[PDB]
Design a protein around this ligand. Sequence first.
Ligand code: ZN
Lengths: 85, 631, 649
Amino acid sequence: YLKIGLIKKDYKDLTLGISNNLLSALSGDYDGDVLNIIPVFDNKMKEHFSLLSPQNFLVDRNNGRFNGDFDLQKDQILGIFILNN
Amino acid sequence: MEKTYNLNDILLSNEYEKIKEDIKEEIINDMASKKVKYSNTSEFAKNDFLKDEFIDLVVDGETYEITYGNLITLLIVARPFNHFKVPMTEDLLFDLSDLKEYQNYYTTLLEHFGYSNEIKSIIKDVISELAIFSGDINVTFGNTVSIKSLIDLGNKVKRFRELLHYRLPNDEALEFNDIEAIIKKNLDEIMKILSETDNMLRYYIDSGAGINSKQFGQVLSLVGSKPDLFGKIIPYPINTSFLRGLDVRSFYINALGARKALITNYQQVRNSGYLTRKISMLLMDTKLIDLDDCGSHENNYLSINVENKDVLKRFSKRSYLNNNGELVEIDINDESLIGQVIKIPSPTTCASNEGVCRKCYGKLFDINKDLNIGMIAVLLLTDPLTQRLLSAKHLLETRSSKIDWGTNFEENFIVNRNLIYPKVYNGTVIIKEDDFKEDEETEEQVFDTFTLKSGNRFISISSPMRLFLNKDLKKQLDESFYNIEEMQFEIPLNKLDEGDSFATFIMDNNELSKPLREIKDLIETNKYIKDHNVNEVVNYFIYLLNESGINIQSVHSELIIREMMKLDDSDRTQFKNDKMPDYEIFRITDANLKGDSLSRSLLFEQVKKQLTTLDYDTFNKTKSSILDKLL
Amino acid sequence: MDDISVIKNEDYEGSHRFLAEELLMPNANKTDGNRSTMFCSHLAQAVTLQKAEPPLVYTNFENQVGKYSTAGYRKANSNYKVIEKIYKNDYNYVLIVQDQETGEYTLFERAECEFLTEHYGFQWDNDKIDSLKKDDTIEKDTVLYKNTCYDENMNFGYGVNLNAAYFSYKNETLEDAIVISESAAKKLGTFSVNKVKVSVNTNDILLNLYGDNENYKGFPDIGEHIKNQIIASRRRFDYNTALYELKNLNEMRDSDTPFFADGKIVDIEIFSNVPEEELKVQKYNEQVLYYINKQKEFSNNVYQKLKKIVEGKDNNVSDKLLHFYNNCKMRIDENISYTYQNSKFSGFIMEFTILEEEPLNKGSKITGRYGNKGVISKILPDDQMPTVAEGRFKGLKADICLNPLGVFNRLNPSQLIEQELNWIAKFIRKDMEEAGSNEEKVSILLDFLNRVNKEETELMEEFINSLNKTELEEFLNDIIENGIPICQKPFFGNIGLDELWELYNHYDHIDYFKCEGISTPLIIGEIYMVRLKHEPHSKFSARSTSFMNLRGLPAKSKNFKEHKDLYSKTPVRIGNMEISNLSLTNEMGSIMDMLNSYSNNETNRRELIMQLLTGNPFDTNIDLSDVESGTSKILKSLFTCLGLSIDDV
Ligand SMILES: [Zn+2]
C-alpha cells in the first residue's frame, strides 16, 4: 500500500519511480517486468488496506523483529560500510 | 572537525538537522577533494579522510571514542530522541562499524517505544535518510571493478599470480573429492589474500556485497567439475578459469549446464504457484481470539526434542512447563534446555473452536493480530523454499562422494576421474555370465563383481560402483572371450593397449534440493503422515527445515500441520479432556476436500467429483469461511 | 557421462564451426553459457539504430552475418538496364529494368521505410536507386537500397560504441541499471513505423483537423507530420442529429471516433467501393478523391508504359512484374470491387504508413554483447557526470555508467576485457597523435596490434603498404580521432589474462583515470551497446472505464490494435494468489467492495463513478449497495442448470 508523492512532468517518461529498499519485499528487480497498480479511492478502504503499508511490514512476523527486507540493499550497504568502517 | 561532541545535547537541540547536514557536507566535500591510494600489499597506505579521523563523544556523562562517519550515522539513527525529546540512553548504543548489529538496534527501538506507530514512522525515516547518504557516499567515493586491479595485486603478491595461473596436474591421477578439496583450499586462499591486503576490491569482500566466493573463485581460479542435466557428474573438469579461457569440451559442459538451469526455471514457474495455492487455500481461515486460557490440558500439550541449537531457535516467545508445574516463557539464550525433551503449549492442541488462544500462539499474538495468521504462516514457509530451490539448482554445483574401492582393487587397479585402469596389462579378467546384469538407466550391461587371475594367484574384487566395460573389449566379448564349459567371460588384459581404460563408472552427486523436496513430499505424498503421529511429524518438519536452511518459526509450522489434521469428533473442546482426542492427519489436497467448508473446496480442485459423487461428503458441509463472501 | 568423451579438442582447433549466434560475441571463450544464451536472445530483441556504427572490438564474422541476412539490403544479382521509372509518391516509386544477359524484365520498388510487425521497422538509404535514371546500368553487385545498419562500405553494425565506466551514481545503478548522458542518448535512437487503417462508410464523415476554412483536409498529406497525435476523426451522420452536430465540423465532439498515431506520413493507399461521382460531390472527402485519382493515374501510367513489354509474345516478364501490372490493370478496369476480410465494405478504407524517430527514454532497455542487460534509470546532462581532469585525457566524459557490484558474479569477464582493450587503445591513439612522423604512427599501431592480434597486424601492414600517402594520412587521422579497430575473435585469437598482463607491464605509463569529485580512480573505455525491444511503451496500460464483456464483466478490446486508443486500456486480473495475499488484511468487506464496484456489480460501479464525478474531489467517501453481484447471478444460473443451489445455513 503506497502513496503517490509526485506526478512526472514528462509525457515520454512512463516509469513508476519506486524506492530501492522496496525491491526485496516485492522479491523483484529492475529487469523491466511490469508491476500492477490498483488505486484505492475510499477513505475507509484506505484505512483498511493500510495494513499492507511498509510500516506494518517493518516488523518481521516470524520473529517479531525488524524485517531485513526493508533494510539497506547491497549498494547502500557498501556506502554505509565505507562511511563507518 | 570539532574533537568533542555531546550526543544528547545535539539530539535535544533544535539545531540537530542543520548540524547533521553540515557534517554530511564536510564529509562529502573532503572525500571529493582527496584520492584513495591502494598499496596492494599487506601494508596499508596512509589515506587520511574525514571519515577515518577519530572524535570523542559525550553520552550520559561518559566519553566514547568513535569515528566522524560513525557520528553522522549515529545522528541519523538517533532520530527518535529528537522526535520524542527523550535523552539518548547508553544501552541504545552499539558498534557502528559492524553493520550486522544495526537490525538489532532497530528491533530494540521497536521494543523500547512499545511498538508505537510513531517509532515505526521514525524507523522508516531513518532508513530513507541513511539510504540517501549511502548514495552520496557511493557517488563521491566511487566503486569500480576491473581486471587491472587483480593484475596489480598479482604484481605485488606473487602468490596471487600463482593461484590465478593454477592448473590441476594432468600428469598424476586425481579423484573427484580431491579436486573439490583443491578448489576449496585455493578459493579460501584467494579470499584470504583479498581480505589481508589493500586492494581495490577490499571494500566489496569485507562488506559482503558484490562478491560471492564461489562465482568469484570460478572467475579467478579453476571452475571445477560440473553436473549433467540428469544429475550425473560429468567426468572431465573445467581446469581453466573463465578469465584465462576455455576449451570446446568445457564450452559444451557449460552450455549443457545453462540449458539445465533454464529447464529448471521453466518447471519451477509452474510448480510454485500450485504448492502455495494449496497451502494458502487451506490456511486462509486460521483465526485468533483474545482468551488467556483455553482450558487445554497440560498433558495434551505436545512434546518436542531440543536436539540442537536451531530447534531451540525455532521456538521464541514460546511457553513451556517448568518442574514446579507453572507455565514459563522460553529464553532462547539458555543452553540448559539442550539435550532435553520439553512439552510445550502448542497451537495444534488448542481446545478453543472459535480461534487460537493467547497461550497456544505465544507472546507473538499481539504482534500478528493485525494480519491473518494462516496467511503469514503460508507465506513464511513458501517464499524461502521456492527461492532456495530455484537458486540452488541455478547454482550448478558438484558434490562428489568419497569411494572406498577396496584393498584388492586399489592394489591391482588405478582409478582416475571416471576411468578404471589396470596397473599391469597381463592376467585375465573373469566375470560370471549372470553377474553381467542390466542397469535400468543405462539400458546396457554392468558387472559388479569380477575376479582377476595373475600368475599363480586368483584375486576376487567387488566394486562399490557399477562398472561399464570398455567398448572395444565388449565388442569381442561373445566372439572370443567366452568359455561355454565354465559359463564365464575370460578377457585377456594383454590385448588391451596401454593407456586404454578397463572400465568406466558413473557417479551421481548429492543435490542440494533433497531436504526441500522432502518438505514438499511430507506435505503432499502422505507417506510420513499416515504411519507417524503429530509429535514426530513436527520434529521431522523442524529437522528438514534445518537441513534446508529455511528459517521459519515452529509456531507457523504447527499451524500448517494443525490445519491438515481433522478431528474424528470435529470439536476442539475434546482437547480439554485428559488424553488426546481421536484425530487423523491428511495431506494438503485431501484436507480441504475432506474438510467441512464448502467454499474452499468448490473453489479449489476436483469440482466434478465433489458435485457428482458424495465421496467428499460435500452436501453435509456447513462450516463458514471468509471465502464464502466471494461466492 | 562418458558420451562427452567423443568431443576431441584437437579436432576443433582453429575452428568456429560449433559457434553460431555466439560468433557475433567477442571473447565467447570467457563468457558463461547463461550470458551467451541471453546474447542470442538479445540479437533477436535488438532494434535498428539510426546511427549504427561498426564495432570497435569485432570478430570479423559480423560483415558475413550482414551479407547473408537479406532483409537489410537489396542486390541486383544480374546486370540490368533501367527501362523506366514511374512515381506513385515523392517517397515511393517503381523502376522497371531488364537483365542485359538473360533478357527478362524485372521490377524494383523503393520506399522510405519498411515495416516488419506492430510498431517495428526501419528507414532506408535510397540514394543509390535515386541516382539511377532511365537508361542507366546496374552492375552485378550493387546495393540499390540499404538499411542504416550497413555503412558505405557494407560493414555491418548492430549497435553503437559507447564510452562506459563502472560507477555507483547516487544508488541509481542498484541491481542492474544504466545512467546515460544525453549526447550518448542521441546515438541510441531508433525508428518506429506503424501501418494504421481507418475505415470510412457512408454513415461517417471525416473532420477538418488539418487546414483552414478554404482548404478541407481530414488527414495529413504525404510530406506533412501528425499534429495533436490524431490521424483523423469520424462522425456518424444522421438527419435527426445533423442540424447541430454537423455544424463546427472543424472541432472535436464527444460523439466522434478518433484515431491515434504519431510520426510522418510516407504512403497512403485508399481503396474505394463508392462511386467516384458521389465523392466528387462530397467536399469533406475531396482529399480522398485527389489521392484516388493519383493512384489511378499511376496505374494508367504503368499500363500505358508496360503494355508493350508484358503483351509482347517474344518477351519475358518476371512474375512480380506481371502481378504488379495485372493488379494495376484491375484497379483501372471498370467494375472493380475491393473486399476486406472476405466482405464487400461500404465507403472506403485508408491505409497510412507513419514513420517517426523514437529516442532513448527511462525504462528502455539497452544491453551489451555479453548478456549485460540494463534498464535506463536516468538520462542526465553530460556535464553532470564523471569527468576526468588529470593528464592528457582531460575533458573526457563517460557516455554511460554501469553497476560495478556483481560484475564477477555474472560470470561475464569479456565486458571488462573489451573495456580494457579500448581503454589502452585510447593511449595508443594519443601516442600516435603526438608523433609527427607517419612511419612512427604506423610503427606504434603495428606494435599494439601485434601485441593483441597478429593476423590483424599482418593485414594492416599490407593495407597500409597498399595505400597512397594521402589515403594513409586520412587513415591515420581518422584512426586517431574516431578510434582503432581491435579484433578479438570469439574462441581462437582472443586475448587472455597473460596477454593483458604483458600489455599492462609493457605500457608502464597507463594508469587509472582520476575523475572530478570521485575518490576512486576508475577506468573508462568504449564497449558495444545494443537497444532491446522492451520499452516503457511496450506494456503500458491504464484503464478506468472501458468496454464491458457480454457477461457484464470488464474485458480487453481490440481498440489499441486498431489505433482507436492511445494506451492499452487492458484490465488487470486479480489472481487467486493475489486474493490470498490481500486476505492478510482481515477486512474482507473492503476487498469485496473493491471487486464488486470495479467488476462484479454494475450498481456499485455506477455509484462509485457518480461519487467520484460529483462530490468533494479531495475527500471521497462512498456508500455502496448490497445488491447481489452479477457474478453471483451467473453462478446461481449455472448451478440451477446443474440442479444444485447454494444456500446460506
Ligand atoms: Zn489454546
